[PDB]
């Protein structure tokens, strides 16, 4: 408790930068993806009104890119770190697996409800690899969960409603196998407008073979490969806030900075998720003006194209990302930079040249 408070007070604005930086040392680059994963771990705020209407507080992110850009590694890492993480591949689980079903018990003759994949994963993370291979029917089934976080089931003799408030990670490959630079993102993604709109963030990853980028990636992979766990004999077959520095894991250049330990990061994430932020009036007008600029950017798009349509859900996405960023640092109110970070994320994700 004391260590968490000391780290929060000393590192005031550096919490969100450091947690994203120290999210996955084994994976190089993709700072925006790490920030989005951190926002998912922090989560939004679920609001219930007097009339009983429910507003979703979860975020949906879809990752599309070329093969071998360390996407499955991120999914596996999130599965390991998340408390309630369930992996469901594209064709591994159908609508029956994802959505709870009704089975008639022969012993008593009554009908009982058996929970589906999403029903069990309440307030958790669901990772879906090869989402492009998934059929449209499963997408429509997942649409209800992504919209209202609930599943309605009605079979003669019984009817009930189950909660499905969950966040989803999806990784998919382009229709052509490799992302086409010349062709528009709409053709490469090959998904319906409703599915993209229900998704909150879209990330496109490119395997740019720059000499420096290739050299850095190769050096990082080679350093990780040559690393061996201490205390183990060579050739044998088989909590501090800052992690102990290693000559191979970190490097001589990275001696100036240290990475956060996994256990302390998990405890801080849990404490932050407990925290309930409150939106301020100053940020509301700024967010509204930026949303109006985003909607009016159609005449200012220049030669850049849009990956996803901008709808009313984007404003809710902006508010939810601001709430997650406010959860990143222990506070009570929403500041200007809190919304600016979300706006920068939206600018990076939505527009591509």
């Amino acid at each position: 408790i004391a260590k968490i408070k000391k780290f929060s007070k000393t590192r005031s604005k550096d919490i969100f930068d450091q947690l994203a930086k120290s999210l996955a040392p084994s994976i190089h680059g993709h700072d925006y993806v790490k920030k989005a994963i951190l926002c998912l771990l922090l989560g939004g705020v679920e609001r219930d009104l007097e009339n009983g209407s429910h507003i979703r507080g979860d975020i949906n992110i879809l990752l599309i890119g070329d093969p071998s850009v360390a996407k499955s590694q991120l999914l596996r890492y999130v599965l390991c770190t998340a408390p309630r993480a369930i992996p469901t591949t594209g064709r591994g689980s159908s609508g029956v697996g994802l959505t709870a079903a009704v089975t008639t018990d022969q012993e008593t003759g009554e009908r009982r409800l058996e929970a589906g994949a999403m029903v069990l994963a309440d307030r958790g993370v669901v990772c879906i690899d090869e989402f492009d291979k998934m059929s449209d029917m499963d997408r429509t089934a997942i649409h209800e969960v992504m919209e209202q976080g609930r599943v309605t089931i009605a079979k003669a003799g019984i009817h009930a409603r189950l909660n499905a408030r969950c966040s989803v990670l999806a990784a998919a490959n382009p229709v052509y196998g490799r992302y086409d630079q010349y062709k528009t993102p709409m053709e490469n993604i090959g998904l319906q407008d409703s599915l993209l709109s229900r998704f909150d963030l879209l990330f496109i990853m490119l395997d740019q073979m720059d000499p420096e980028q290739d050299r850095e990636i190769s050096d990082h992979v080679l350093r990780m490969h040559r690393y061996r766990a201490p205390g183990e004999q060579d050739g044998d077959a088989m909590t501090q806030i800052y992690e102990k520095h290693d000559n191979l894991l970190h490097g001589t250049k990275k001696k100036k900075e240290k990475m956060v330990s996994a256990a302390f990061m998990k405890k801080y994430i849990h404490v932050a998720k407990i925290i309930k932020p409150v939106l301020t009036q100053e940020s509301a007008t700024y967010i509204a003006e930026e949303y109006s600029r985003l909607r009016s950017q159609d005449s200012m798009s220049s030669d850049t194209a849009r990956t996803s349509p901008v709808t009313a859900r984007t404003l809710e996405t902006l508010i939810r990302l601001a709430t997650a960023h406010a959860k990143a640092r222990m506070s009570k109110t929403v500041d200007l930079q809190d919304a600016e970070e979300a706006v920068e994320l939206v600018q990076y994700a939505y527009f591509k040249k």
């Binding site: 093969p67 071998s68 596996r76 490959n173 196998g177 490799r178 073979m209 000499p211 290739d214 050299r215 190769s218 992979v221 080679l222 040559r226 766990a229 050739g235 088989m238």
Partner: protein, 279 residues
């Protein structure tokens, strides 16, 4: 127990590689590089686990492209016969650590695939667009070989003479040409080598392969940029892993605990001759 001494004596020779290569389909004329690749595929690499729980493939996958009549099905049948575990398909669970041969390409299993040209016969002038498989599925294969009907009058005469000699002397005698190993003995030797031990690379060989991989990636970049066209056979870290596996298999063939630079050089030469010529 005596077969242990026999295998140790056989593997201690300086010419085990050549004997094994000659033992792979002595009936088929030519294809020495293909026979060596088939042999090292049969020996295979070694799988390694990690503390994080991730696993890396210890099996090699190969792809063959060529005109009909290049004796591909015969090679697949010979591989299926020689391997301790072998499955032959026309295009996985029952095979564990064995070799699966797939014809008409258009779970710890090694994959050996054969396929035909898109137009039926290879077109040299057109270059690319002769392969229908997407780059994503092509990247899984460690090496890709291209065979063309090299029409030489003297080569046709030699091929006919070899076929007729096999036909005539086949019923008369069934003996090894020059120290060829019997099928059962080779099978048992391969099984013993796979069961006994698996080698690992060294630091100097690692650095050499690192430099060669960087140079090859830069050259592939330059070729793609100059050609102004996307190559159907990209080069990634999986190619480096495949070369590492081939070098380990070459070291495994000699039962040495540590791989040498010669194995890495031979693996690099084979990878060049296959992929770079294919690409």
């Amino acid at each position: 127990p005596q077969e242990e001494e026999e295998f140790r004596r056989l593997a201690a020779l300086p010419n085990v590689y050549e004997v094994i290569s000659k033992s792979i389909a002595p009936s088929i004329f030519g294809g020495t590089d293909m026979k060596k690749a088939i042999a090292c595929l049969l020996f295979g690499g070694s799988r390694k686990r990690l503390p994080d729980g991730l696993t890396r493939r210890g099996d090699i996958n190969l792809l063959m492209l060529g005109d009909p009549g290049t004796a591909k099905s015969q090679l697949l049948k010979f591989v299926e016969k020689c391997s301790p575990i072998g499955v032959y398909t026309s295009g996985m669970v029952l095979a564990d650590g064995g070799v699966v041969c797939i014809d008409e390409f258009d779970s710890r299993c090694s994959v050996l695939a054969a396929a035909n040209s898109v137009f039926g016969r290879w077109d040299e002038t057109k270059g690319e667009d002769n392969i229908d498989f997407m780059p994503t599925i092509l990247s899984r294969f460690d090496m890709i070989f291209i065979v063309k009907d090299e029409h030489n009058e003297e080569r046709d005469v030699m091929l006919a003479k070899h076929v007729i000699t096999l036909h005539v002397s086949a019923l008369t005698q069934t003996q090894a040409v020059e120290g060829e190993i019997d099928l059962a003995k080779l099978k048992k030797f391969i099984a013993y080598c796979r069961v006994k031990c698996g080698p690992r690379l060294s630091a100097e060989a690692a650095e050499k392969l690192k430099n060669r991989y960087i140079i090859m990636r830069s050259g592939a970049r330059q070729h793609e940029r100059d050609s102004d066209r996307r190559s159907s056979i990209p080069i990634t870290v999986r190619q480096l892993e495949a070369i590492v596996r081939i070098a380990e298999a070459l070291s495994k063939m000699k039962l040495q605990p540590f791989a040498t630079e010669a194995d890495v050089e031979e693996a690099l030469r084979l990878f060049q001759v296959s992929t770079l010529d294919a690409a």
